[PDB]
Design a protein around this motif. Structure first.
Motif, mmCIF file in Angstrom:
data_model
loop_
_atom_site.group_PDB
_atom_site.id
_atom_site.type_symbol
_atom_site.label_atom_id
_atom_site.label_comp_id
_atom_site.label_asym_id
_atom_site.label_seq_id
_atom_site.Cartn_x
_atom_site.Cartn_y
_atom_site.Cartn_z
ATOM 1 N N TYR A 18 0.893 -1.174 -0.114
ATOM 2 C CA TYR A 18 -0.101 0.073 0.173
ATOM 3 C C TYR A 18 0.833 1.309 0.027
ATOM 4 N N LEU A 47 -1.382 8.598 -0.789
ATOM 5 C CA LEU A 47 -1.855 7.304 0.344
ATOM 6 C C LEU A 47 -3.169 7.859 0.686
ATOM 7 N N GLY A 51 -7.067 5.670 -0.644
ATOM 8 C CA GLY A 51 -8.029 5.964 0.485
ATOM 9 C C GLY A 51 -8.777 4.721 1.115
ATOM 10 N N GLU A 52 -7.893 3.669 1.336
ATOM 11 C CA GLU A 52 -8.557 2.454 2.063
ATOM 12 C C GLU A 52 -7.456 1.827 3.208
ATOM 13 N N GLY A 53 -6.388 2.836 3.303
ATOM 14 C CA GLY A 53 -5.260 2.223 4.438
ATOM 15 C C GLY A 53 -5.610 2.715 5.667
ATOM 16 N N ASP A 54 -4.589 2.782 6.709
ATOM 17 C CA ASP A 54 -4.703 3.046 8.110
ATOM 18 C C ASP A 54 -5.204 4.606 8.380
ATOM 19 N N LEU A 55 -4.632 5.413 7.511
ATOM 20 C CA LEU A 55 -5.016 6.997 7.468
ATOM 21 C C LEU A 55 -6.676 7.146 7.521
ATOM 22 N N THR A 56 -7.202 6.587 6.309
ATOM 23 C CA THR A 56 -8.689 6.708 6.175
ATOM 24 C C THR A 56 -9.662 6.067 7.098
HETATM 25 BR BR LIG Z 1 -5.270 5.573 3.570
#
Ligand SMILES: [Br-]
Length: 163
Positions: A18, A47, A51-56
């Motif tokens: 990712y 990142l 838009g499907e990672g830890d941040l989101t």
């Molecule tokens: Br993300």
């Protein structure tokens, strides 16, 4: 020399898929705008674009205004001066963020770097970014991020592939 070069390369190989894909996206974006340096802002933009990672997941959980973060990154992107290079390099702040994120991950016993580790590194060294609209990313402490691992593992695309 060689040892430093191989150390920087090993750090890049530790990024999960990712984060690596987003770093390649940031390098491609820099190339299209002929910019000399790949900054953490270029990386964060890509990142959030995935838009499907830890941040989101964290943004959704803590009700961050994601639109304002995206607009701040666009504003930062458009205000950066051109700096002639046929091909971009990683900025000093990006090498520092990468190295600190690995140190955060390795202290947790992890073998790979995920976006939550980049966030952990950022919250402990806020000056790695020079974009005011990134203030929500500085709201959670490293201890809070660590405690949130079960939620991130249930909702993020950066989760383990097995039980
Ligand atoms: Br993300």
């Amino acid at each position: 020399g060689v040892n430093n070069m191989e150390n920087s390369a090993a750090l890049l190989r530790r990024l999960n898929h990712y984060c690596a894909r987003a770093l390649e996206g940031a390098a491609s974006l820099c190339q299209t705008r002929a910019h000399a340096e790949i900054t953490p802002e270029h990386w964060l933009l890509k990142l959030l674009e995935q838009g499907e990672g830890d941040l989101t997941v964290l943004g959704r959980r803590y009700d961050w205004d994601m639109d304002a973060i995206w607009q701040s990154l666009l504003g930062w992107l458009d205000n950066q001066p051109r700096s002639v290079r046929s091909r971009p390099q990683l900025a000093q702040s990006l090498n520092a963020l990468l190295k600190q994120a690995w140190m955060v991950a390795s202290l947790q016993g992890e073998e790979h770097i995920r976006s939550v580790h980049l966030l952990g590194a950022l919250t402990e060294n806020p000056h790695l970014v020079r974009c005011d609209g990134l203030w929500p990313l500085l709201t959670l402490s490293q201890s809070q991020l660590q405690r949130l691992s079960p939620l991130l593992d249930a909702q993020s695309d950066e989760c383990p592939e097995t039980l």
